[PDB]
Design a protein around this motif. Structure first.
Motif, PDB file in Angstrom:
ATOM      1  N   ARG A 181      -6.859  -3.942  -4.770  1.00  0.00           N
ATOM      2  CA  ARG A 181      -7.757  -3.533  -5.913  1.00  0.00           C
ATOM      3  C   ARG A 181      -8.645  -2.380  -5.239  1.00  0.00           C
ATOM      4  O   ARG A 181      -8.758  -1.362  -5.870  1.00  0.00           O
ATOM      5  CB  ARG A 181      -8.653  -4.509  -6.056  1.00  0.00           C
ATOM      6  N   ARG A 182      -9.288  -2.424  -4.035  1.00  0.00           N
ATOM      7  CA  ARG A 182     -10.349  -1.480  -3.549  1.00  0.00           C
ATOM      8  C   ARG A 182      -9.532  -0.137  -3.342  1.00  0.00           C
ATOM      9  O   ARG A 182     -10.087   1.055  -3.757  1.00  0.00           O
ATOM     10  CB  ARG A 182     -10.686  -1.997  -2.240  1.00  0.00           C
ATOM     11  N   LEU A 183      -8.263  -0.280  -2.978  1.00  0.00           N
ATOM     12  CA  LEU A 183      -7.451   0.865  -2.695  1.00  0.00           C
ATOM     13  C   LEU A 183      -6.877   1.655  -4.076  1.00  0.00           C
ATOM     14  O   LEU A 183      -5.968   2.602  -4.010  1.00  0.00           O
ATOM     15  CB  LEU A 183      -6.247   0.768  -1.749  1.00  0.00           C
ATOM     16  N   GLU A 216      -7.873  -8.389  -2.978  1.00  0.00           N
ATOM     17  CA  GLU A 216      -9.072  -7.535  -3.027  1.00  0.00           C
ATOM     18  C   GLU A 216      -8.858  -5.992  -2.280  1.00  0.00           C
ATOM     19  O   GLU A 216      -9.221  -4.943  -2.690  1.00  0.00           O
ATOM     20  CB  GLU A 216     -10.188  -8.135  -2.265  1.00  0.00           C
ATOM     21  N   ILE A 217      -7.995  -6.036  -1.353  1.00  0.00           N
ATOM     22  CA  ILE A 217      -7.706  -4.714  -0.641  1.00  0.00           C
ATOM     23  C   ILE A 217      -7.135  -4.089  -1.522  1.00  0.00           C
ATOM     24  O   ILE A 217      -7.475  -2.808  -1.498  1.00  0.00           O
ATOM     25  CB  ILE A 217      -6.905  -5.191   0.590  1.00  0.00           C
ATOM     26  N   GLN A 277       0.766  -1.166   0.044  1.00  0.00           N
ATOM     27  CA  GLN A 277      -0.037  -0.137   0.107  1.00  0.00           C
ATOM     28  C   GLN A 277       0.816   1.242  -0.002  1.00  0.00           C
ATOM     29  O   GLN A 277       0.572   2.353  -0.814  1.00  0.00           O
ATOM     30  CB  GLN A 277      -0.936   0.094   1.018  1.00  0.00           C
TER      31      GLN A 277
END
Length: 182
Positions: free
Chosen positions: A113-115, A110-111, A85
């Motif tokens: 992607r969302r960020l 998934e984390i 991140q």
């Protein structure tokens, strides 16, 4: 699609890079602990640079440096999604998820992607995991196998299952040369 050179001895990597570029490889990546090693890999025509660091701020330093030099494609690899991140916050082009367990992998993908991660890569010697990452939606799949036979077998299958950018990482340019032809 992508051939990843991983040889810590700076002498040899430079050779491998020169050979593959001669053979019409359009995307070549190099993974190293030293941004200085990464620097000359770029000068000699390395398309992608993969920072493989543990300390967040050590990584942050190398990324910024490599960006300053005008490196267009910088990738980061780590087991902790928090580091990835932070790299993304600083403009890291590609994020490489390197986890052992499938459910931990799918959680980290998934984390990111969302960020807002746009290029997510997954690496593992288990092509069962790679397959699940493809269903989920990981962009790039990095095959890491010990012998050629098993590596070509996985590429074809992943191709069959619809993977569109497949990277291969090895220490053996004969192996990588085999991957390009395929």
């Amino acid at each position: 699609d992508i051939l990843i050179v991983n040889a810590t001895d700076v002498d040899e990597m430079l050779k491998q890079v020169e050979i593959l570029r001669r053979l019409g490889a359009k995307q070549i990546a190099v993974v190293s602990d030293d941004w200085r090693i990464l620097q000359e890999a770029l000068k000699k025509g390395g398309d992608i640079l993969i920072v493989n660091a543990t300390d967040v701020d050590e990584m942050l330093k190398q990324v910024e440096i490599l960006r300053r030099l005008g490196a267009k494609q910088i990738a980061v690899v780590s087991d902790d999604w928090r580091i990835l991140q932070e790299a993304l916050k600083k403009g890291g082009d590609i994020l490489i998820v390197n986890a052992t367990d499938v459910d931990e992998m799918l959680k980290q993908v998934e984390i990111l992607r969302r960020l807002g991660a746009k290029q997510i890569a997954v690496v593992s010697d288990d092509w069962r995991i790679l397959q699940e990452a493809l269903k989920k939606g990981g962009d790039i799949l990095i095959v890491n196998a010990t012998d050629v036979d098993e590596m070509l077998k996985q590429v074809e299958i992943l191709r069959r299952l619809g993977a569109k950018q497949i990277a291969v990482v090895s220490d053996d340019w004969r192996i990588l040369q085999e991957a390009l032809k395929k």
